[PDB]
């Protein structure tokens, strides 16, 4: 139990007072005949460590319009904030998750911590759209369908088959 030094005011005797645990502050210091009175931190204030503050710290982390609470102000900790859905954190801002354009697809969706990740669609796959959810999808497979090839696909357009075989 960590302590701090003090003095009894009636006698002048030296005292050894208990500090106060997370969530509390020193409302009244010890005396020769009583321990330190630890008060609970009021709303909007916290102490995260053992301390001998006479007032708790202010919960001063405010969430912007693109953020929401990752943790509430509690007597034990300050508030904390993360980017809301659709946004990631960068350089103290909350930016819009990028879209992967046509020709490329999502390999990891965006999170509050990272931007959308993207790759160029590999051979055999495509993405036709600018999108922050769409992955590279495999081309329509004319041979598996027993159908004739009509127009070959690319990294940004699906293969087209006719509607019948050749005979």
């Amino acid at each position: 139990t960590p302590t701090y030094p003090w003095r009894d005011a009636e006698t002048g005797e030296r005292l050894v007072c208990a500090q106060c645990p997370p969530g509390t502050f020193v409302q009244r210091p010890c005396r020769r005949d009583s321990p330190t009175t630890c008060g609970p931190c009021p709303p909007r204030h916290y102490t995260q460590f053992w301390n001998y503050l006479e007032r708790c710290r202010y919960c001063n982390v405010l969430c912007g319009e693109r953020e929401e609470e990752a943790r509430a102000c509690h007597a034990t900790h300050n508030r904390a904030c993360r980017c809301r859905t659709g946004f990631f954190a960068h350089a103290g801002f909350c930016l819009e998750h990028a879209s992967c354009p046509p020709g490329a697809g999502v390999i990891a969706p965006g999170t509050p911590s990272q931007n959308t990740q993207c790759q160029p669609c590999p051979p055999g796959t495509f993405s036709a759209s600018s999108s922050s959810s769409e992955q590279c999808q495999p081309h329509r497979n004319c041979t598996a369908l027993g159908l004739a090839l009509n127009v070959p696909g690319s990294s940004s357009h699906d293969t087209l088959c006719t509607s019948t075989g050749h005979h």
Binding site: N60, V61, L95
Partner: protein, 139 residues
């Protein structure tokens, strides 16, 4: 007792009315000592020369590419604000951050007030009490 104050950015700070910024006056680092406050304004109760100051933390994504940060006096004797200390900054020259700081000595009478205005106000980061603020002390 020598008048002083330090007011901090708050959740209410940006009214979007084109009126002045609002400030916190009691919690965390903010205090008033021999000055008052009403609706964004520091209200003077003791006449004299004051060093007034304000810092605003500005920030934005890419991009009136010009930001004006100022302190202005209101007096009941005249129906328009008087400019005291004003800065113009074009910091938008992606994510950017810039701080604007103003300080200076002005004479203020009892019943006069001082307010801070930023145009455009929405570039002000009001989320951290250590970053945008407004204060004064008598000299």
């Amino acid at each position: 007792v020598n008048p002083a104050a330090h007011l901090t950015g708050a959740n209410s700070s940006l009214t979007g009315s084109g009126g002045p910024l609002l400030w916190e006056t009691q919690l965390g680092l903010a205090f008033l000592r021999g000055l008052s406050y009403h609706d964004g304004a520091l209200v003077v109760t003791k006449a004299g020369y004051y060093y007034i100051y304000s810092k605003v933390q500005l920030g934005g994504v890419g991009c009136a590419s010009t930001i004006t940060h100022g302190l202005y006096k209101r007096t009941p004797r005249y129906p328009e604000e008087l400019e005291l200390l004003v800065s113009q900054q074009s910091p938008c020259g992606r994510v950017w951050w810039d701080s604007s700081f103003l300080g200076g000595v002005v004479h203020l009478e009892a019943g006069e007030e001082v307010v801070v205005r930023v145009l455009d106000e929405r570039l002000v980061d009001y989320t951290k009490e250590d970053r945008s603020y407004f204060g004064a002390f008598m000299v």
